[PDB]
Amino acid sequence: QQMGRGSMCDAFVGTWKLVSSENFDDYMKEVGVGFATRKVAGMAKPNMIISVNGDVITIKSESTFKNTEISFILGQEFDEVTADDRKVKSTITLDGGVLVHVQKWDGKSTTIKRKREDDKLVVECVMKGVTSTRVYERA
């Protein structure tokens, strides 16, 4: 083995903590999340851990609501069971500086975009006209 060089993906790597959320309940309603799940999910203040090993990116979310972890290669679709228990087909691509995560299920689609802004990692979740913005800071 030899040491890998860096990538643009490196600005995402680290441990992040949710600090603010806007319009998340409305986004979840658009997605179809039930009442009790929305309530509990909406309280959570997760930590998100993003790491890279070769071509594989891992995004772990640790919270009091659910823990989740996904591992993927950019452009390569995978199965995901989401925190709210949807079984979706996901594809994550890096488009410029933005991680773009598309989830497809039951003829529906939502997109989650992650981008660095100043020292924050801003997450935009979009489901037809409804957007939620979640902001993470370094833990």
Question: DSSP labels for 54-76?
Answer: TTEEEEEEE-SS--EEEEE-TT-
Structural biology method used: X-ray
Binding-site residues for a fatty acid sit at 134-136
Task: Look up residue 26 and give its two tokens.
Answer: 């409305």
| Measured distance CA(128)–CA(114) in Å, rounded | 18
Please, are residues 89 and 96 in contact by the beta-carbon 8 Å criterion? no
Resolution of the solved structure (Å):
1.1
Angstrom distances, CA of residue 51 to CA of 32, 68, 70, 97, 111: 30, 14, 11, 16, 21
Binding-site positions read 134-136
Structural domains in the chain, CATH included, are: 1-139 (2.40.128.20)
Cα–Cα dist 6/26, whole Å: 38
* Percent of residues in the chain assigned helix, strand, coil, to nearest 5: 15, 55, 30
Query: Residue 28: which H helix or E strand, with range?
Result: helix 24-31
